[PDB]
Design an enzyme around this catalytic site. Structure first.
Site, mmCIF file in Angstrom:
data_model
loop_
_atom_site.group_PDB
_atom_site.id
_atom_site.type_symbol
_atom_site.label_atom_id
_atom_site.label_comp_id
_atom_site.label_asym_id
_atom_site.label_seq_id
_atom_site.Cartn_x
_atom_site.Cartn_y
_atom_site.Cartn_z
ATOM 1 N N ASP A 130 3.711 2.747 -16.036
ATOM 2 C CA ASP A 130 5.036 2.847 -16.633
ATOM 3 C C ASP A 130 4.971 3.468 -18.022
ATOM 4 O O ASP A 130 5.544 4.533 -18.273
ATOM 5 C CB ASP A 130 5.675 1.458 -16.710
ATOM 6 N N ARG A 160 12.235 -8.946 -8.175
ATOM 7 C CA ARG A 160 12.447 -7.992 -9.259
ATOM 8 C C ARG A 160 13.670 -7.127 -8.989
ATOM 9 O O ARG A 160 13.946 -6.765 -7.842
ATOM 10 C CB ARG A 160 11.229 -7.088 -9.487
ATOM 11 N N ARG A 167 0.915 -2.517 -12.520
ATOM 12 C CA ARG A 167 0.110 -1.444 -11.953
ATOM 13 C C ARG A 167 -0.513 -0.588 -13.048
ATOM 14 O O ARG A 167 0.059 -0.402 -14.128
ATOM 15 C CB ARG A 167 0.970 -0.563 -11.051
ATOM 16 N N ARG A 175 9.757 8.156 -10.936
ATOM 17 C CA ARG A 175 9.146 6.837 -10.980
ATOM 18 C C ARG A 175 7.624 6.949 -11.067
ATOM 19 O O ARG A 175 7.038 8.013 -10.847
ATOM 20 C CB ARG A 175 9.583 6.011 -9.763
ATOM 21 N N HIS A 217 0.841 -1.189 0.000
ATOM 22 C CA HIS A 217 0.000 0.000 0.000
ATOM 23 C C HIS A 217 0.882 1.246 0.000
ATOM 24 O O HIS A 217 1.836 1.321 0.785
ATOM 25 C CB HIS A 217 -0.916 -0.007 1.223
ATOM 26 N N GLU A 277 8.007 -1.723 -20.262
ATOM 27 C CA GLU A 277 7.908 -0.375 -19.688
ATOM 28 C C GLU A 277 7.800 0.770 -20.694
ATOM 29 O O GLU A 277 6.759 1.426 -20.762
ATOM 30 C CB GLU A 277 9.095 -0.096 -18.758
#
Lengths: 942, 940
Positions: free
Chosen positions: B587, B440, B625, B757, B166, B550
């Site tokens: 991304d 990752r 995501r 990011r 979260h 990405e």
């Protein structure tokens, strides 16, 4: 088979008794599913046979042929032993299922105030009785007492329910949980907004649970040790009562707010307590040894600790707050010897001290010894309460009393209800076993023979010893096995913590010497904190003499110093009724209570009565409400103890909601009586009771005592002989072989006649008494009618007789006679059945009912739906008794009927209930099965 | 201290959404109880204050008048520090209660088939989607598949849900249970057949529970450790999923029953699985160390053992039968040849209860299983043998399957198919680790390692070699038989971290891990490098290697890279016909805007599948995501059906984002529905693909992509002062400095948004209710298309109504606009943005309004969310609490940023940590950030 059992049930009941009545649909739902599981496991011919059995029996109830049961008996005869056990098994399971459905229907029945007619008669049924708030409102609004007076009364009230062994079946927690899952599926299946998929899956779950209950065969687990009997007895406390008490006590808080009292019932109030007879009662039961008593005390302490450990763990999870007292903060960081959660670190310490407490008990049980220190454990309720009350005070100090009045308050109420041993243990032994001890003492010392001395010579000597300061019991005293058992028990009492025990009860108590004798023995065997001594007046003569006995005890300085203003007395119903019939026993008891009470008031002592087996007060399903209200005025005053019989423990406590209502009515009735006593009896009522009593006693003893052929009839027409010889019932059935009914014991007396559906001990003597009063004066019929309608004592005493007549059947009692009684004694049998029908007819007349239980259709419906299964087992029992007793009576052997499996050790299977069986394989297990099921169906009678 | 909040809600939404709609009643009930607790604890004037700000915010939404935001801010201005924290936390709790009420309403809403209009649009809302039996029936009766074809598909299907941390909130088991008690009392209070004392006592319970949740609050001093985050994520597994999937799997059994298949789904089918990133994802997160990975793996095994011990114990209570088969009897007899430190079944177990004897042995081996892991965690070693324990799931399954077949041998299959079947399905779902861990790490960290050893050995410099020279060398080593990695190798701390991670993988059981995912993957070299490093660090059972692509350029080349790997003999031998690839939405959208990312993604999937089919490889895609598939509440159903044809075929992996875990798994019923729609959509897509795109649809998407990318880049890359505006108009700067995301916000200091990011990019702009990353570029693209030809407006309308990909793409945008508010975004500007840059902000808000208006036009809607009143109602009733936190955030940001700021003394209005900011500011800002995030949930 194809067709449902629905139809055969509809023809037994005269319609719906309330418009949310779904009982018949419930019964059909469960047993239809059972029969299908039976067919898939053992084949259609077996399932068809069982269903035919049920249909024949249901039709007999519709109108009582007797011809049809004999041909049912004909088919059950000649089943192979394996098929007989399977049939009997299945009918018992069906009866269990029916009882589960009935519990569900009572639990979720919508209350209907329109049924109330006002007055005390409403408190005889659960459908019409008054909850705790209604009785509070009646006390303030009609009786006129203050809310403050009611609050104070509750604070000083204690109801003590005493658990006793089941006569035929133990209940393990596993099965109670299987019962609850069957009930839950039935409830959910009848939700209004049910999806088809949920319904399909709940259906599959219900079938699954029923098959699991059928393949465990708790029925055929062979009777357990006294320790196991006690462990299984605690199952209801684990499964319902443990969480029930806090739920009800919270409803008491609700009720007092609703009469203007704006504070909760303080958590230190012992409003309800629980006691045990399992492992404590040794009267005529030598299997109950001193080591068994020590064992059940330690077991109780283990189970308590386990229930506390889980409650405390759920509580730790909830109380994640960080704000707290200074005092709690200092203690929390002390124990750090996560820190931002102070309630959690206190409660985690309590949990570890609880683990120590349980392990210590486990070691003492296994080894007699434990190096786990009493320091490391909880030795007192005070030491256990300290951390919990610290948390309560802390949370209130920081303004979150609302949180503290959640589960923490529940836990505090549980500690003040159950303590560290769940239940307190009652000890019971008969009076002459104590006389034997003291006589061994007196002759060993050369003082004389205490046995031969007068009652007052006994008193004079015992008071000389008790006031004296010199010991008496020699360490080298020659003891027999019985004397060693009595002394050894007292030594076990001396070695264990005081809060493990309730009273020491004296069976067959007759005179003040019986009480003072055990006071002396308690001291002389080293009990530093003696138990209160409690006489049990069983015979009529002893009930007559009881007020004199207790007055002379109260006249003695030493005894008044010991009892410190409190005395307990136990009274027996089935005990006294076996002596001189029920009706006289009931009237002598009312008066004995009346007289004992003013004796007690004169000397300033708080008298507490302990109601034994057979009482109207024992009908915990609902009628106990009225029965308590009917007690003589000023006989309770906030303190009472009642025996919870095994045969009704499932009906009162098996189901969450029923547990709630059972606790509620005991506390409401008891509270109300102290501030709202029943009508005092009129003189003509007393006079008529007095004359009826002599007629009833003379009629009872003319058949039971003065008739030479009676005992031979009794052991032919009932399974009393086989009950004893077989592996059921735990105890020796009578005190000495062959002194008639005199030496026979209460339980076998009532059990044996209830199995045959005759119930002779409950009603015999009442027909003669009623007839005598009607014939003496024509106006007496109207006065008995007025007594039934106006006098609570008289109503509850005949309400019991009515219920037992509803549970009786002269046709079936005659079938036992037809098969098992010698030709020369059959006329005697039909004369007893003449007395049965004449008693019932006049009982109905005095009550003003046209047919049995008119005015309680709810009870009538619940009972009649059991009979199809009970009657099947009645026919099975009678014919099994004839083949047991008559070696070359047979009829046609039949080819096997069930199907499955070459796996099984077939022979070993017929004999599970008693592998050491001395009867031909299958008969003992078939007879025990009928006995278990008939007992399960009949529940409480006399 | 008197009136209810009811009224102010009713004017945000005036009326029912269905005849069963009690949401406003529910909200009012809980919040009125909370305010009363508030007044009882802190006094009436504080209670009145918090209710007043709720009212000002609620009326702003009623008609968006900028003026009262400023006066609300003027009121929050004057609170003393303690009072500001109190007001912020109370508004936060009120938002939490509103979310609880919404869950209850969704859970017990009676489905109403009258609102289904047929066709794929029905699968976009929970109110109208298909349950699993309905889609089974559709597959057999409409598509024309046989029931056995459907049964076979289900047996070969797996959906793998991947839990992620979260961005701002803890979720302790303690609180999840307090939540459940609040929901249960709310539902029970609304039963109609209820007695008044039952009502009175359930009311007292509700208040008691609301208060306990309020007074367990406290701190965010130290940001949570990865181990804690992992504990946070397993709480939903404990509370809802554990018993969730056995119950769902029982529902597919009955659905198969209802299409003629009279078998249950075999218990060895892992139809649903769960994975984790917590403790495994180390991409730009040096907090995640090798030992952190070791620790989360051992913790998982402990809690697994604990859940099993409880299930086994209650199964011991149920299985009291005495009949069993011969094999079980001899085994039970054996174990009677050797139970005290437990609560239940402490006494020796009799041999005539065979299932209890076996299961009690299972419990004791599980206890050893747990204690061994606890010892390995505490000390690195354990004298508790692996033999005493369960070391594989096969060893665990043998006693369980022995009981299953014995039960069936003796005719008790019905009993077997009860809880035992549930337990078996749990073992085949969760194994001995509950979740599998994804590892990752970014690709350049691997190149750094390999360059260190090529230089140390004197071979040269792997960094300087071209992609072809890298491949030729890697495969020469991969085919060779001689080791490579020197133990003497000079390692930096970063290099040692990559090497050390691989060593931890090598020393743990294979079942604990999922794939090794390479961030910023670009070329086949990135994959083969990790395959070599895996072997040379001694991972005897290598993890499958997964590239994450990405950027747009990387998605374009993805099919080429996939094909190159598939033509290599060594790699085909290793992957043995199965390959997984990960795609990022947030991304790719950060690179060139949302619309271009969405269209490049569809094409990349398309082409990769065709490559994989040609080489006979089963391609599984892992959706990262920001995906439309990530809307687990309902729209996932359509979003999965909208995938390119033959992109899934029984195998898919979806990221469950933290912001949504509570909405999909918090409540028993909604978790059932979450599991159900993932299963149904996946199954159906494989047998019923969506329409193939028309040529004119493709061409229009191609043209719009260029225009969208151009205008996205024109503002975020080519506008010199954008960075400066962004760090002014959002709390991004404070997000990083206070370490909210636990992870560094940028990859490198400097470089603009490119080195920023994805999480902070989406987070920073969602806090201000602007949502720039989600929509920017699409307004220009829509306007270009309609302007260049007459006919394109009709073509776009037809696309919205006929093409699932386009529908779900725009439905997300519509939902995010419903969550947006230019007025509030403009107040952030007015307070914190330099005068010279505010025109630039007004132009960005102009493109917001232009984008929204044209999106409505193409959808045929006149108001936002016109086709989804249920969701529109659910969102607007959150805004009063989020809007209050918005204005509190904007004013606290200017206070924090001002070096001259001190605290003006003010009188308390309530009756009753060592931060480095001026008193109150730090905790106030954290509270607004957490509350706004809780209220906005998933956007882009």
């Amino acid at each position: 088979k194809h067709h449902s059992i629905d139809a055969q049930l509809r023809q037994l009941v005269p319609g719906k008794v309330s418009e949310d009545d779904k009982l018949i649909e419930y019964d059909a739902l469960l047993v239809d599913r059972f029969l299908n599981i039976l067919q898939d496991l053992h084949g259609p011919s077996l399932r068809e046979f069982v269903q035919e059995c049920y249909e024949v029996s249901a039709d007999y109830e519709g109108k009582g042929d007797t011809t049809k049961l004999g041909e049912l008996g004909a088919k059950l005869t000649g089943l192979a032993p394996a098929d007989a056990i399977l049939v009997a098994s299945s009918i018992l399971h069906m009866l269990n299922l029916a009882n589960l459905a009935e519990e569900v229907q009572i639990a979720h029945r919508r209350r209907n105030s329109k049924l109330k007619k006002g007055g005390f008669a409403d408190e005889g049924s659960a459908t019409t009785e008054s909850d705790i708030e209604e009785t509070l409102k009646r006390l303030v609004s009609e009786v006129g007492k203050s809310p403050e007076e009611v609050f104070e009364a509750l604070k000083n009230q204690t109801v003590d329910l005493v658990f006793t062994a089941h006569p035929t079946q133990s209940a393990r927690r596993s099965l109670l949980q299987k019962n609850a899952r069957i009930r839950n599926c039935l409830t959910q299946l009848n939700a209004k907004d049910i999806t088809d998929d949920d319904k399909q899956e709940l259906d599959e779950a219900l079938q699954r649970e029923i098959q699991a209950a059928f393949r465990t065969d708790e029925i055929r687990r062979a009777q357990p040790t006294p320790q196991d009997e006690m462990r299984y007895g605690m199952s209801y406390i684990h499964e319902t009562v443990w969480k029930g008490v806090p739920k009800f006590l919270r409803r008491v808080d609700t009720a007092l707010k609703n009469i203007g009292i704006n504070e909760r019932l303080p958590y230190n109030v012992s409003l309800i307590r629980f006691s045990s007879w399992m492992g404590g009662d040794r009267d005529g039961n030598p299997r109950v040894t001193p080591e068994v008593t020590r064992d059940v005390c330690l077991l109780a302490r283990m189970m308590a600790a386990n229930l506390y450990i889980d409650q405390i763990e759920e509580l730790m999870f909830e109380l994640s707050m960080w704000r707290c007292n200074d005092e709690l903060r200092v203690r929390a960081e002390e124990l750090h010897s996560p820190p931002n959660e102070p309630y959690r670190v206190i409660l985690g310490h309590v949990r570890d001290k609880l683990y120590n407490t349980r392990e210590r008990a486990r070691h003492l049980l296994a080894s007699g010894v434990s190096e786990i220190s009493a320091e490391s454990s909880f030795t007192s309720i005070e030491e256990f309460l300290e951390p919990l009350e610290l948390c309560y005070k802390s949370l209130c100090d920081c303004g979150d009393k609302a949180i503290a009045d959640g589960s923490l308050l529940d836990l505090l109420r549980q500690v003040f209800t159950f303590g560290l041993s769940l239940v307190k243990l009652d000890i019971r032994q008969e009076s002459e076993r104590h006389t034997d001890v003291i006589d061994a003492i007196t002759t060993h010392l050369g003082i004389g023979s205490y046995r031969e001395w007068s009652e007052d010579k006994r008193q004079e000597w015992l008071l000389s010893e008790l006031r004296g300061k010199r010991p008496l019991l020699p360490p080298d005293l020659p003891q027999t096995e019985e004397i060693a058992d009595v002394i050894g028990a007292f030594h076990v009492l001396a070695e264990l913590p005081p809060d493990s025990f309730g009273p020491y009860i004296i069976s067959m108590a007759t005179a003040p010497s019986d009480v003072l004798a055990v006071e002396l023995l308690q001291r002389e065997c080293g009990v530093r904190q003696p138990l209160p001594v409690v006489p049990l007046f069983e015979r009529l003569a002893d009930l007559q003499s009881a007020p004199a006995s207790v007055e002379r005890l109260f006249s003695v300085d030493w005894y008044m110093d010991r009892i410190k203003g409190k005395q307990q007395v136990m009274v027996g119903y089935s005990d006294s009724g076996k002596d001189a019939g029920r009706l006289s026993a009931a009237w002598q008891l009312y008066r004995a209570q009346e007289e004992m009470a003013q004796v007690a008031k004169r000397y300033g002592v708080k008298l507490t009565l302990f109601h034994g087996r057979g009482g109207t007060v024992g009908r915990g399903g609902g009628p106990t409400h009225l029965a308590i209200l009917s007690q003589p005025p000023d006989t309770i005053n906030g303190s009472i103890r009642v025996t919870v019989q095994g045969e009704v423990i499932e009906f009162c406590f098996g189901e969450e909601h029923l547990c709630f209502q059972t606790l509620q009515r005991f506390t409401a009735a008891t509270l109300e009586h102290g501030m709202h006593p029943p009508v005092s009896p009129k003189p003509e009522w007393r006079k008529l009771m007095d004359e009826m009593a002599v007629v009833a006693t003379e009629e009872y003893r003319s058949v039971v005592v003065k008739e030479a052929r009676f005992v031979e009839y009794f052991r032919s027409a009932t399974p009393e002989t086989e009950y004893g010889r077989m592996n059921i019932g735990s105890r020796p059935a009578k005190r000495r072989p062959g002194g008639g009914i005199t030496t026979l014991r209460a339980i076998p007396w009532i059990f044996s006649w209830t199995q045959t559906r005759f119930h002779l001990p409950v009603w015999l003597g009442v027909g003669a008494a009623f007839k005598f009063a009607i014939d003496k004066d024509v106006r007496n019929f109207q006065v008995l009618k007025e007594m039934y309608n106006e006098w609570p004592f008289f109503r509850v005493t005949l309400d019991l007789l009515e219920m037992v007549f509803a549970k009786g059947d002269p046709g079936i009692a005659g079938l036992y006679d037809e098969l098992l009684v010698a030709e020369e004694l059959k006329p005697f049998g039909k004369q007893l059945r003449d007395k049965y029908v004449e008693t019932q007819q006049l009982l109905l007349q005095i009550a003003g009912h046209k047919d049995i239980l008119e005015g309680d259709p709810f009870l009538k419906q619940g009972l009649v739906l059991r009979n199809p299964y009970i009657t099947t087992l009645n026919v099975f029992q009678a014919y099994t008794l004839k083949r047991i007793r008559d070696p070359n009576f047979k009829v046609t052997p039949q080819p096997p009927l069930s199907k499955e499996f070459a796996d099984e050790n077939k022979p070993a299977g017929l004999v599970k209930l008693n592998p050491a069986s001395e009867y031909p394989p299958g008969l003992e297990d078939t007879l025990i099965l009928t006995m278990k099921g008939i007992a399960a169906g009949m529940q409480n009678t006399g």
